[PDB]
Structure 1
Amino acid sequence: IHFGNLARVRHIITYSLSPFEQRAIPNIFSDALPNVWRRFSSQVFKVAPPFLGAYLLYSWGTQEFERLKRKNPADYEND
């Protein structure tokens, strides 16, 4: 029992139509996509950064490791 004791609500009217009188995926270009982009923009500069900043650290550590495996001719110039 949870429907009926939820909240004291007053003066809000809502309107909705049967699923059969409307389109499932409507206004894909006029509304859908524009917002997909909108949402994508609002976040990139929050998420992307640390992830990119990770990639770098990954690349560096990786390449440096391989580098330290290579031989330095400056150990054999003498003999």
Structure 2
Amino acid sequence: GIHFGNLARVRHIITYSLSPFEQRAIPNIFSDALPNVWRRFSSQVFKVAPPFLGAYLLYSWGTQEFERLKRKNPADYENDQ
């Protein structure tokens, strides 16, 4: 339950922070934010997208194939009389 104070042994690290009221909440949207969203997107698209593309194809096929097998095969009545 109580942990702050006995977590880790740290030495020689200085940190600097500003009050929330002295800064912008959502700063550098175009110079930083978006450029990074692109970076992130880019670096994961070929890891993620591929398998989903594969599933999408299999879906398409199997769906079409299913409907195709519902159609009539003209070659079943060529010599019917």
Q: Deviations over 1:27-74 (max 9, x none)?
A: 000000000000000000000000000000000000000000000000
Name which structure has the greater RCO, CA cutoff 8 Å, separation 6+.
1
Scaled by the length of structure 2, what TM-score is found?
0.96
Question: Please, which runs of 5 or more residues in structure 2 have no aligned partner?
Answer: none
Question: Please, which runs of 5 or more residues in structure 1 have no aligned partner?
Answer: none
Distance (whole Å) between structure 2 residues aligned to residue 4 and residue 78 of structure 1:
91
Which runs of structure 1 show a deviation greater than 2 angstroms over 4 or more consecutive aligned residues?
none
Question: RMSD of the alignment, in Å?
Answer: 0.4
Scaled by the length of structure 1, what TM-score is found?
0.99
Q: How many residue pairs get matched? A: 79
Identical aligned residues as a percent: 100
